[PDB]
Design a protein around this nucleic acid. Sequence first.
RNA 1: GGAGGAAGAAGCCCUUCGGGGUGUAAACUCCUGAACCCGGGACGAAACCCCCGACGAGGGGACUGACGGUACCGGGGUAAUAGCGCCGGCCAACUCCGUGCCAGCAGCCGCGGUAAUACGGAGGGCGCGAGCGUUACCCGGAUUCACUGGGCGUAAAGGGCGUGUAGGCGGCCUGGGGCGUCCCAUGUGAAAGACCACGGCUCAACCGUGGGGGAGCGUGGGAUACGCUCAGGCUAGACG
RNA 2: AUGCGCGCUAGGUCUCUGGGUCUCCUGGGGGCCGAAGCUAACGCGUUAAGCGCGCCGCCUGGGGAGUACGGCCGCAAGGC
Lengths: 208, 261, 150, 124
Amino acid sequence: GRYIGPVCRLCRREGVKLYLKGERCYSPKCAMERRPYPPGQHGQKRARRPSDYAVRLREKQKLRRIYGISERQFRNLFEEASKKKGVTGSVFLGLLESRLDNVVYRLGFAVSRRQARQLVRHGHITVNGRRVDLPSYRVRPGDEIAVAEKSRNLELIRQNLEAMKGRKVGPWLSLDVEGMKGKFLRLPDREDLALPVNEQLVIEFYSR
Amino acid sequence: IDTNILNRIVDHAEVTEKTGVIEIGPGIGALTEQLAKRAKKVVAFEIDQRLLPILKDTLSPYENVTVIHQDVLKADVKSVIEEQFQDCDEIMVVANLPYYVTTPIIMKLLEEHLPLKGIVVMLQKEVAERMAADPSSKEYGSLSIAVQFYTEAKTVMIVPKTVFVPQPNVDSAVIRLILRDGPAVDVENESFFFQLIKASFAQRRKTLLNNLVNNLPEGKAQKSTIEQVLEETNIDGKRRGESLSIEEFAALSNGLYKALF
Amino acid sequence: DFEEKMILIRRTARMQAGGRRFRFGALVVVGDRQGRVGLGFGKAPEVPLAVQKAGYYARRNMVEVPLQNGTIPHEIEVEFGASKIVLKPAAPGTGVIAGAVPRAILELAGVTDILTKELGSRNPINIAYATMEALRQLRTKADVERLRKG
Amino acid sequence: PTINQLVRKGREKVRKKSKVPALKGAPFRRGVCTVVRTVTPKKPNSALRKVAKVRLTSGYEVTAYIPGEGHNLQEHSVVLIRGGRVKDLPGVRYHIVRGVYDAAGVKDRKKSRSKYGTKKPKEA
RNA sequence: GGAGGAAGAAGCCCUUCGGGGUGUAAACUCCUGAACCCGGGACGAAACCCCCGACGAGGGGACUGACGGUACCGGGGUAAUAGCGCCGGCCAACUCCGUGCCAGCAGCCGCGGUAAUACGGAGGGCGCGAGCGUUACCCGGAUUCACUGGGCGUAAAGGGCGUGUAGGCGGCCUGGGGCGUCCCAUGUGAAAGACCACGGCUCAACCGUGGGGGAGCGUGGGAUACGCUCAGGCUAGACG
RNA sequence: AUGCGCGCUAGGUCUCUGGGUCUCCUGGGGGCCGAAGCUAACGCGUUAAGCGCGCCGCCUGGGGAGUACGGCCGCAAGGC
Ligand SMILES: [Zn+2]
């Protein structure tokens, strides 16, 4: 299961523009350009100084809600990252950025991660010429992520990937727009990502 | 914290001992004190019953202040100006607008064709480039067109987030609009002109032709007409729309309405 | 010009001839997140005056911290009164694992990765003083070599 | 002590003490109510607190607290006894699980329903 | 379910009567295609046996599937379950009515007598989510049995004082032994489990194949600084 | 209200008792101020509650309670 329901309310609560909706959250409608205060009856009141715990929780929540994965899955990924070599922050973000749904969103086949999840699940995506329908699949440096032949005639995919013309993909990825495919060069770095997140807070949270 | 930012805003608004000013949402009257000190007779449109005593107490030692218990949108400001500023030369507008009713306020003020000299407002940076931009700016849109048609506008001051007493969520930009004597381009069918502008920017990813044809009730009917008109006007629909300007829009509007209006 | 934090405001009272007279104490850390930390304690009849005095004291009492890779050169154990602080270096990617008072102090120091622990008494004032002293008692390789060899 | 003393005598381990003897290392117990009475708080509080004298399947007979707005406990009703101690009442160290055996879920609950066990109110 | 979707529908709640929230949330357009139907359909099973080789090594031919018409594949094709706890400080989450030390709440500090963010209910918010809470037990926090790592003047804690047995501990300079101690090699430290890496189930859980690591203890060799022991000597402790 | 033995770490002052070259140096004992240092503080500070070492005896929230019980010792009270 996941979180299904209102979304821009999370944009408001976090106080940042989390691009969770696709095209609306670019146009003057993201509900962060209007009412940038948290939701509810006591949204636009004076904010008290937040606790250390509050700050850490908010940072972790923001990071989790960007990728829209379970708290259990988030904890699992953190525990895996903390057990590996190198800086925990870098490794954790690398592991988060390797998810198949996220990779599809980065490639440009889908506009929102909530849409990439549906594309992957309903089966319109192959890795190394084999159908995979799980958003949580982890890709390694050097897999071909493509759209299935049976799914290339869809309006949705054509509109999505046609707009990628005159648009650049991330450095840690390569794309073939006319061939409708993509390549995972390597794991991304801290600076390759435009996250409004300081991972140090997330590290300090899961020590409590 | 607001100690000197207000003074800078008033300086940029360029008020003097003979200019009249309009205040919206005064609250306590942080800007109002400076305006009274520097400018001539002022006016306020407070609607909050709770903050009225505080505003009254703030403006007790001032004699050039008038307070109105009307909402800006509902009140016809033409009579307000003809009644209050009966001797003044230039009437400007200075206010800090409360997020939600910020675009409606500006639109209502501009659409009523006031004899205002101009406007200087403090709003969020978010919708600040959205109302002062250029072709291919990633912020070009309907709001930009409306503001840069009705008046001449450019962003002046960038107040960062870390200035206020309770830390807000968004950076702010004080914008100054010098009102324009005559509309930049002449359109007979102004309403459908505006709808055309909003149609070309219904979705910013699609091409202009597809935008125009897919956003009109008669769009299906006049596909050929739309195509021919965009072709003849030397500005084709094969572009996105964000790369156009006021001039191309004017020519295209003329093309549509001279032939189908 | 610097960043400030509020460890605690507390209200103390002394009895008088028919009544109580109150006073306020504030514990304030002033730092630049670069390796300069000051800690002040201010007493005043009013809260704002207490904060002002604490800020002034913290500015006038500053210590330079020898940070390498955003951490501490070596482990340290310092006892102030009944309270005791333990600081320990950590590899990059650990984060300041510490209680409220140390954390506050160390964040303004530019420390990014430390393992700490408080022992014995846990009076926040005494903990702050102990931590401050422990920071004051840090030497690097260069200083040690200079003292020993010359 | 000295290392020699530690070798000779050592350190005595601290043993825990049970707060719920009547349970006999079980999450719950099944008992029968014999007396249903209202009693008085310990010091600063004043109220009438419902208390049942329950005889358990253990070799024990103890007092248990009845939480909620209203109950239906007679002098025979089979009940479930749970851990937990009332701060005020001097001698009760057990609670009653609502809506289990003969005890019924308190009426018109809408907020905290898992406790005070009541079914979800159907709404059309 | 996904994308778009009002300066913002209706109802409900609050209101300084202007409005604010629930909220792009809904309704609404388009798109996908859990469930469901049709067809196909397994890996797990090649041996024993039989013919030619000797009754051997090779070679050649058949039989055998509970799971199970299941997994899975191909083709059609439907917008298609959300609950649970908490919102006084610990500790993330605030207002309006009801009640007036009553009904109650409670892990601690405590809250309940007329203006209750602490009880009851609504609106709203927060955390987790096919789950969420409660009770019981264990380790942590507990440096609160303190080897790592505590104390005993007044906070609990120096025996009423001597003499002394077992025990514990022990000054300097040499030489022998090599018991403790340290090092090298080797045997053992089973298979699972733990760590690393690489692989198989569409990922994971799960499983496979490798590689280490390991406290302890045997066997052989080596070192003698420090403890131990044997022999000689010295005068700074002690004794005369 | 401070177990014993040993070594180390400014001094000044008042006493009791020995030897010396007797202006004053040199042992031992009893007090008072105080360096460094210690202590929660009061305070201790070469007669340490400092810096260390060796051995012994005790402590682990307040009541219940030095109580009940069992044992040992006493003529008994009673004690451990
Ligand atoms: Zn948004």
